[PDB]
């Protein structure tokens, strides 16, 4: 059930998209990634110099899908501000941390969590070795991305993500995942 | 079966034009996102006009409910809360979080507060981590409740140990609402 | 298939004439949409009648009381008309219409009964839930006694089991004001 | 279940020959009836010789567990109880109900006591009746535990409000058993 | 929950709106119905202007061989040059389609992944029917290796050896392999 | 996810405006009816302008496929057929049934022809009736293929005994199409 | 299909007559009870004669595994343990708990040790109770392994953090067994 | 519907009756429970007489590696010589067990089939857990190739190449490979 | 529900096994093959010179399982007479035809059917090629076995088994699959 | 729930000792095999003593029923048939196939004859083959019925076109049985 607004009839999310606001509010798969990539490219084509706001409330999801969002944020000229409302876990926390530096925000009771990737393999030993190597490459890459955007040493990030690593908004600020905890509007 | 008005509105969209939002379901991430979206939209249209949030919900996910809570505190527009029916658990937190003086209940509405519910699976290491998170959430929700009701924290911790039901008048005495409204001329 | 009108689906068209249908079992979403319609019509005009057509087996107590409370709250008088059946929470809502403007079609029926529920959990949790339902049972008997004019002790006895009334019997009970057969 | 010759026994039937009964499953009416049948049989064979009830059970239905409890008190034969593994809820009541002086635990066995749980659907009148029955059951089980452990009733009622787990040594301190047994010498 | 745009009256969902800018998404596993709708957009855009570039964004694990080849053939069939961009993943038939973009206009985002491998299938039936189905798969396997060799510039024997099992490439490795022409990091 | 064009067309509806029809799914009665409806509509719009039928289908029900076949022969408008992807069984009959000279394949498209498949349960009398119908369908389809390909009937009957797969060039040699097209100028 | 021997024994019952018990399935309460019953029976038959416990199990419930562990320590009869196949988690604890000097492995048998796994749903209070129990079980199992292997407690706790697989020779180096046997004269 | 024999009082099902003649059947997929019951029969027969031959008839597609290795080790563990006979099929771990029979006493019926191939498995979990499981599979793969090389006399590199995919052998080919010692057609 | 006989208690099939009679009365899988092989080896060990009777009423089944039965019939010294009652299809018809020459029988309304094998393959193209080669080898082998035991030219057998090839008892006699149609007992 | 006699018999095994066989289920291969096994056993014990086959069956698979039929004709022992309840389709063929003069029905037993029922799936070629088999079975069963009843083949073909029900007295007049038996002294 999603309500509508006029002025031209908009659903609420389309209405906010007109104001350069995108929601990443679901677990992340290819389809979620494609629609977020589509909106980022659209907004950047309309104006490559105006801020885009990406609101995040997501438990994360597929690595390749999350990296397509990450890469498109880095690619577009428009600066992408990130705001976690609720939860930003796993690939969603990487995306949060990938916002334009200085414009990564959290609501006071929002939560961030980072952890190593999860996977599965079925097949002959030969096929398993191939797939295990890919997941091991993904694990290293995500730690490198997190270290780069938080300023933390890679060695520390690798230690912290070995299991589920939960951060309050203030703790995520100290970690370097966000730039500001926002409580009240101007 | 959602009715319409005429350019074309469903009934909830029509009320949204009048700065009325409904929280009438169990709360998950998707419900929180759409309520947050409506709050931000209305606050962007006019940060000085009241928003009314009608509540009829059994609660739901803590993170999702806290996203609504934080957005209510964040926006400049004052958010009046009205429980029709029931406001339980995270929905009771949100009810109590409305603009002070503008928190209302219909006469036969019910409020219920209780500690959070959860689940954990995994190794002992993973379970300890998840158990810590449930424990922090329980403490935080009791703190938010004490803060918006004025009750001492210890009393709240004790009252929410099991399901704690309040009538509208009892919720008023508890500090969860400001007024029980029976008739419209009384406003 | 729900047909349309151009000046609307048929229910939206009737809402333009200040008519609301309560024609399904009552849960939170049904209560919310009926409440929304009542508030909308009352904000359009707080002095003109609203007509609530009822054909429902009842449903959740909290949801039914949300409709009941909103009917009492709005300034607009809410006329109630049972077509078909009005059972349990829907019979409460019928009886709560503006006095003098509660109607029934000749073969429509009303049924009143104590609430129904369930509880699972430890003994401590069951004790809490049992007392909420027992408070609900008393309150619904009090509301029915109030709007019918029957003594509370009589209502409590009559609703111990399913208590069916014809339209004429519901009139005598005090749950409605008039059985209407013809339009005229 | 293996078999023994010298005319063939399964292992549990073979141990019954030595006056040993196993309570090794969740407790329902059926489990209670066969345990009761074994208690009555052994007591009729010899009302003066000890019976050994080995316990490894998460508990179960109250009425079924109390049928075992009552039959233990009823028979003249002394019933020694031994928890191997776990004795939870109604099974902890049964453990504690063994002949005083003859309630034993292996060193890593676990005991747990807690208030009863249940459910009912129906009219308010029917729910009121069922809630009353659960409340009487809760009081009765706390009274039985107070009786056999020597603990004050108020303490037992406070302890069983939620799951109350005890090690073997803690169960000894509680009064639920008489001895933690480690090796077969005494 | 796909958002909409108004007259950028005219109402577009976001993908229809990008289609107006000659952008097509291949963002799902490939079956006949996905292939048909991508072929339809290719034919439509080429009829509107046969000289303007088309951009095909790819985020797909691949799929049915016949369906992927319908997309491949339609790309060569239309006069409009089709640029391919892998965002996320381009595996199997999707990697064939990525590599089939206009030479010089095959792109990857920095962390996109490409994977190539021999086809997979199944058949039940009599030995006669199974032999027929096995022969079709072996022809498909050879054809896909030939198409890949053609668009990468790699020797056929190398491609056949590399696709015997799942062969994963980073964006930079796919450039070195010849499946793409450029890894793009920032817009400009 | 089917995109739209501008007033409002989905992409297939937009292409239908240019006299293009897709047969891109397994064939049942509902697929045949909508393809028949599009053929009749285009032929009524202009009985002299070409219609393009794009084919990517594994075939399907015989009666449904023959309704498409019969409607193509019936309408005055010439129907060009183009297999993109695959055209198997009734879809291959339909491909071969396009206007002589205007039956096309993309280079890696595939055609397959084979005898019909069915099933029946019932009494021996009922089974005998159903077996004779499938027998008549098998003969009729071989006759239609022989007609549109120019192949002798005994050859078609031998070839369709089991799944008979053809590349685009081999389908050209068979007489099922008139031209393999690589670039669009060829049409 | 379990064969029989002659009066009537199945093969496991026949081997039980020779004081041999198999732990060859995942461990739950029912498996522990029947293994306990066999240990008590053999020990009552003769408290001085060796019992052989053949192990091929992925482990299982902690309480069930500890009932087997405790009964082995309790009975006067010495219990030799022999892993054929695999002995993981509680089965590895049971293997290492055999009589000192009489813990054996076949050459390609494998041992694996790891911390316990569980789950719980419920209120925060109930979850806190269950997390402390799994925490106590995790510590207790590391202490038991340290005792029977001679390894320092901190090493066992580090090693069992994730699945820790050992060959027969590596389990010998760990102290989980006393001898790798290739031919039967070695026992 | 397994038939019975009487005192050939004493009642045997047919398999228990053949067990009396020191015959064991491995005629199902191999899991822990199959391995345990075969190990139990091996231990029982060897305790009754450690010097008399045991006959293990094989008709199995293989199964779990640990379970098959428990049978393999117990065959070497017992003093009694274990003769293996493949009737029907001996694939994977069952082919390892076939080849592990007493040298000179490994047999095949004329149309029996043998197949060898690398192990298969699966895992879900965190990357850390997956790496642990992948390492166990790779050790199992190497160990099984080493055991096969040992009992066939084949070079390790040859066995590793041959088991990369399903490697089927007729009875005569299995003799030439070294997995069996004799193809037997008629009794005598 | 299978009835019993005495003299010693036998089920009916075990009682007939005492008279050297084996039933192949089910579809053929490994388990069916193993139990038939077990009975053939048992009877041949009891007396390698006395006839064994194999009654057949089966639609056939797995090729490897059927060949294990076939090979054991050829292996044992005891002559195996085959009798089809009801139906002998596919692998069951091969087994029927493999009986001792002169002692292969059919009841008058029994039916025989021969046809090429059926299979399935799933996997990469490489795996499919391997499996398709195995089924093609099985198809050739079964035609060679049928030709050898019927005396028919291999080329004819290969043509006849291309689809389901049904034979009446008299037609199976003329084909060489059996030696005699039996109507009445001596 | 099958009762016993005392060395130990279930009730059907006890009656088998008296040369009584029950055909009391739908007929498939497994039922035919066990009835054939009993017929052969009894005939081997004494080829000169009557066997009684009690019938209460709706019929079943043709090949399975024909195996019983052929074994009845094959054995030297005369097989008397008695329908109690119902003998339909293949069970009616078997009833009519008992030893002439020894085919009986209880007074309210029912007999029904009808053409066979089947199913076919596959290509047209495979369906034609299966259709031929159903057709041969239909002709053969009508021939067997004409042979044991003495009815002309054409009449049987006509009567079995649909379900053809007979009372015991009508089955006697049809030639399917020889006697309706009401009381035991009448034998």
* HEC-encoded secondary structure of chain G: CCCEECCCEEHHHHHHCCCEEEECCCECHHHHHHHHHHHHHHHHHCCCCCEEEEEEECCECHHHHHHHHHHHHHCCCCEEEEEEEEEECHHHHHHHCCCCCCEEECCCCEEEECCCEEEEEEEHHHHHHHHHHHHHHHHHHHHHHHHHHCCCHHHHHHHCCCCEEEEHHHHHHHCCCCEECCCHHHC
Residue D177 tokens, joined: 């058993």
**What residues contact residue E75 under an 8 Å CB cut-off, 6+ apart?**
E42, E56, E82, E97, E100, E101
d(CA H41, CA H27): 14
- Burial string for H105-130 (b: 16+ CB within 10 Å, else e) reads bbbbbbbbbbbbbbbbbebebbbbbb
Sort J4 into a burial class: Cβ within 10 Å, 0-12 / 13-18 / 19+. Answer: exposed
A107 touches chain B (CB under 8 A): yes
d(CA H36, CA H66): 11
CATH of the structural domain A1-186, one choice from 3.90.226.10, 3.40.50.1970, 3.40.50.620, 2.10.109.10: 3.90.226.10
G32 touches chain D (CB under 8 A): yes
Mutate one of C115, C122, C128, C137 to test the D interface: name it (highest D CB count within 10 A): C122
Residue A28 pairs in a beta bridge with A61
Interface contact flag, A65 E59, Cβ < 8 Å: yes
Cβ–Cβ under 8 Å, residues E34 and E63: yes
G165 touches chain D (CB under 8 A): no
d(CA C153, CA C140): 13
Indicate the Cα dihedral angle A80, A83, A88, A94, nearest 10°: 30
Cβ–Cβ under 8 Å, residues F65 and F144: no
Sort H88 into a burial class: Cβ within 10 Å, 0-12 / 13-18 / 19+. Answer: buried
d(CA C145, CA C46): 27
For the question of residue H92 being annotated catalytic, the response is: yes
Strands F103-105 and F79-88, sheet pairing: parallel
CA angle, C106 then C111 then C116, to 5°? 160
d(CA G170, CA J102): 80
Strand segments, DSSP code E, in I90-130 are 104-106, 111-114, 118-124
Helix axes F29-45, F62-74, angle to 10 degrees: 10
Q: How was this structure determined?
A: X-ray
**Distances from the Cα of J46 to the Cαs of E32, E46, I151, J74, in angstroms?**
70, 91, 39, 14
Tell me phi and psi for residue D29, to 5 degrees: -55, -45
Residue with the two structure tokens 């010097």:
H51
Q: Determine D/G contact with 3+ CB pairs under 8 A as the test.
A: yes
Task: Write the Ramachandran bin of F101: left for phi over 0, alpha for psi from -120 to 50, otherwise beta.
Answer: left
Sort C105 into a burial class: Cβ within 10 Å, 0-12 / 13-18 / 19+. Answer: middle
Q: Hey, which chains touch C, using 3+ CB pairs under 8 Å?
A: B, D
With contacts defined as CB-CB under 8 Å, which chain I residues touch J32?
57, 85-86
Number of H helices, E strands in chain J: 7, 10
CATH architecture of the domain with residue range H1-188? Alpha-Beta Complex (3.90)
Mutate one of A3, A27, A42, A139 to test the E interface: name it (highest E CB count within 10 A): A42
d(CA F160, CA F142): 8
Cβ–Cβ under 8 Å, residues C53 and C19: yes
Residue A167 tokens, joined: 């951060």
**What residues contact residue A45 under an 8 Å CB cut-off, 6+ apart?**
E21
Q: Locate the chain A residue with the closest alpha carbon to H120.
A: A124
Sort I132 into a burial class: Cβ within 10 Å, 0-12 / 13-18 / 19+. Answer: buried
d(CA E117, CA A123): 15
Tell me phi and psi for residue A152, to 5 degrees: -80, 150
Interface contact flag, H109 I72, Cβ < 8 Å: yes
The CB density around residue D52, as the number of other CB atoms within 10 Å, is 20
With contacts defined as CB-CB under 8 Å, which chain H residues touch A136?
127, 131
I12 touches chain J (CB under 8 A): yes
d(CA C107, CA C88): 18
Cβ–Cβ under 8 Å, residues C66 and C44: no
Which of the residues G57, G80, G89, G148 is marked catalytic? Answer: G89
Cβ–Cβ under 8 Å, residues J149 and J96: yes
Residue D42 tokens, joined: 């052994």
d(CA J80, CA J49): 11
Sort D126 into a burial class: Cβ within 10 Å, 0-12 / 13-18 / 19+. Answer: middle
d(CA C162, CA C160): 7
| DSSP helix/strand/coil, A177 | coil
Cβ–Cβ under 8 Å, residues H97 and H26: yes
Cβ–Cβ under 8 Å, residues F62 and F141: yes
SS3 letters for G135-168?
A: HHHHHHHHHHHHHHHCCCHHHHHHHCCCCEEEEH
C130 touches chain B (CB under 8 A): no
Q: Please name the residue ranges forming H helices in A86-163.
A: 91-97, 125-150, 154-160
With contacts defined as CB-CB under 8 Å, which chain F residues touch J123?
114-117
Interface contact flag, H165 I127, Cβ < 8 Å: yes
With contacts defined as CB-CB under 8 Å, which chain I residues touch E128?
116, 162
d(CA B10, CA B17): 11
Question: In the Cβ-directed half-sphere of I150, how many Cα atoms lie within 13 Å?
Answer: 26
With contacts defined as CB-CB under 8 Å, which chain I residues touch E115?
none
Tell me phi and psi for residue H102, to 5 degrees: -55, 130
Q: Please name the residue ranges forming H helices in chain H.
A: 14-20, 32-48, 65-77, 93-99, 127-152, 156-162, 171-177
Q: Hey, which chains touch H, using 3+ CB pairs under 8 Å?
A: A, G, I
Length of chain H: 188
Indicate the Cα dihedral angle F126, F127, F128, F132, nearest 10°: 110
Cβ–Cβ under 8 Å, residues H185 and I74: yes
Cβ–Cβ under 8 Å, residues E101 and E161: no
d(CA H54, CA H82): 5
Residue B123 pairs in a beta bridge with G117
Q: Please name the residue ranges forming H helices in B46-123.
A: 62-74, 90-96
Cβ–Cβ under 8 Å, residues J76 and I185: yes
Residue C79 pairs in a beta bridge with C51
Cβ–Cβ under 8 Å, residues F63 and F22: no
The H-or-E segment that residue B171 falls in is: helix B168-174
R_g of chain F computed on alpha carbons:
17
Q: Please name the residue ranges forming H helices in chain A.
A: 12-18, 30-46, 63-75, 91-97, 125-150, 154-160, 169-175
d(CA F172, CA F166): 9
Interface contact flag, E79 F108, Cβ < 8 Å: no
d(CA A24, CA A20): 13
**What residues contact residue D104 under an 8 Å CB cut-off, 6+ apart?**
D80, D81, D82, D83, D177, D178, D179, D180, D181
The H-or-E segment that residue I129 falls in is: helix I125-150
Query: How far apart are the two ends of chain I, measured CA to CA in Å?
Result: 31
Cβ–Cβ under 8 Å, residues H115 and G146: no
> Would you please indicate which residues of A are annotated as catalytic (active-site) residues?
90, 115
d(CA A63, CA A142): 9
With contacts defined as CB-CB under 8 Å, which chain D residues touch G23?
none
d(CA A43, CA A50): 9
With contacts defined as CB-CB under 8 Å, which chain E residues touch F3?
13, 15-16, 19, 37, 41
d(CA J97, CA J73): 8
Cβ–Cβ under 8 Å, residues I45 and H8: no
Domain C1-184 = CATH 3.40.50.10490: no
Interface contact flag, H44 G14, Cβ < 8 Å: yes
CATH architecture of the domain with residue range G1-187? Alpha-Beta Complex (3.90)
d(CA C127, CA C118): 12
R_g of chain I computed on alpha carbons:
17
Strands G79-88 and G51-57, sheet pairing: parallel
Residue A4 pairs in a beta bridge with A11
**What residues contact residue A58 under an 8 Å CB cut-off, 6+ apart?**
A24, A25, A26, A27, A28, A87, A88, A89, A92, B29
CB interface of F with J, residues 53-82, below 8 Å: none
The H-or-E segment that residue J90 falls in is: helix J90-96
Task: Write the Ramachandran bin of I162: left for phi over 0, alpha for psi from -120 to 50, otherwise beta.
Answer: alpha
The H-or-E segment that residue A180 falls in is: strand A180-181
Partner residue opposite A4 with nearest CB, options B9, B73, B76:
B9
Residue G155 tokens, joined: 């090493």
Residue J131 tokens, joined: 């259709």
H183 touches chain I (CB under 8 A): no
Question: In the Cβ-directed half-sphere of C25, how many Cα atoms lie within 13 Å?
Answer: 3
**What residues contact residue G3 under an 8 Å CB cut-off, 6+ apart?**
G10, G11, H13, H15, H16, H19, H37, H41
**Distances from the Cα of I104 to the Cαs of E135, G102, I165, I179, J44, in angstroms?**
40, 60, 19, 5, 20
Q: Hey, which chains touch G, using 3+ CB pairs under 8 Å?
A: B, D, H
Residue with the two structure tokens 């009416």:
D29
> Would you please indicate which residues of E are annotated as catalytic (active-site) residues?
92, 117
Q: Hey, which chains touch F, using 3+ CB pairs under 8 Å?
A: E, J
Breaks in chain H, named by the residue before each, with C–N above 2.5 Å? 8
Q: Determine E/F contact with 3+ CB pairs under 8 A as the test.
A: yes
């Amino acid at each position: 059930v999603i309500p509508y607004v006029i002025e031209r009839v908009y659903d609420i999310y389309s209405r906010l998209l007109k104001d350069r606001i995108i929601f990443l509010g679901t677990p992340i798969d290819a389809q979620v990634a494609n629609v977020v990539v589509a909106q980022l490219l659209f907004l950047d084509a309309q104006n490559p110099n105006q801020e885009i706001k990406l609101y995040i409330n997501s438990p994360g999801g597929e690595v390749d899908a999350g990296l397509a969002i990450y890469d498109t944020m880095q690619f577009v000229r428009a600066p992408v501000s990130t705001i976690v409302i609720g939860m930003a876990a796993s690939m969603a926390a990487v995306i949060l941390a990938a916002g334009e530096k200085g414009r990564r925000y959290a609501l006071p009771h929002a939560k961030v969590m980072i952890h190593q990737p999860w996977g599965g393999v079925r097949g002959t030993a030969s096929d398993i070795a191939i797939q295990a190597q890919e997941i091991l490459k993904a694990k290293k890459l995500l730690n490198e991305i997190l270290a780069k955007h938080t300023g933390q040493p890679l060695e520390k990030v690798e230690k912290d993500t070995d299991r589920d690593y939960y951060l309050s908004a203030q703790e995520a600020l100290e970690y370097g995942l966000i730039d500001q905890v926002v409580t009240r509007e101007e």
